[PDB]
Amino acid sequence: DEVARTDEWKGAGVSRLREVWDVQHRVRLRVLWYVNSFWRSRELSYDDHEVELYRALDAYRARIAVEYVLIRAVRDEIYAVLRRDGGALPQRFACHVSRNMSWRVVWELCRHALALWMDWADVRSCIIKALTPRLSRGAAAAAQRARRQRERSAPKPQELLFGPRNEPAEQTWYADVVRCVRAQVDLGVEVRAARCPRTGLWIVRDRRGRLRRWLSQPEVCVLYVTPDLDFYWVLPGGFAVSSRVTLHGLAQRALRDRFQNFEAVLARGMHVEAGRQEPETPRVSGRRLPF
């Protein structure tokens, strides 16, 4: 009568149990070493040469460094475009101004604000949450759809008389808010954006619908980034450094595996039909019975 593997696996037990760490020393978790694993019987060999670990460290350095050098690319993009225009930035955002007010101090506050933003960048920032939906498949599909959509010819009166009708209302931007008097920056700002009917300037609002009012505060500064990866940098008064974010100096696969929006597999609790109303999550309870 052959002993089933669960019995002598149960009576085998564990040799040893120890903790390990991540690279950045943020996570401690414990490994388990059963004596009855076939890894014990596989007698596999092991070696750790120093240039191999050095290559591992350089690869990990690049994998960390991707978003930080993207931030540096954004910063010297700002520097190049302020050197480009000569330093006289125009207004893109709808808010009134006062002539009898010294703009030298808000210019100095803008310099200090971009400095403090460079000190306090993050892997979770405005531009990362901006370009994370760009990595999706539907981003490419809707890019093709918009490139055929806006670049569509003027219609003849025949489809005006008999053809079916045609339909881009407001934008979903992200923002960094750097507050110099309290030395606190902001990384994740979700903001709705629109255009005024009377003038082409922008109007920003809360995702609930509340008007965003920080532009009146002179000590603060803001950075806006769009879903099509444009770039604004607004000091108070609505005047905006305007450019695009450069990423050609970064590899495709490093940005693609370092962070990417995730498409889900089907598990318990979700519909087989796509886009149906989701029921309640499984939510295993430490408060109720397991049942």
């Binding site: 690279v23 950045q24 020393h25 460290l57 350095r61 960390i64």
Partner: peptide, 27 residues
């Protein structure tokens, strides 16, 4: 700076393991 953080961490723990090795080397 994160590479310097992990580098000084690994240097510190590795010299501590070397001290544990050499202290139990002279029995």
């Amino acid at each position: 700076v994160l590479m310097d953080r992990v580098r000084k961490r690994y240097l510190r723990q590795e010299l501590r393991d070397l001290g544990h090795r050499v202290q139990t080397y002279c029995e």
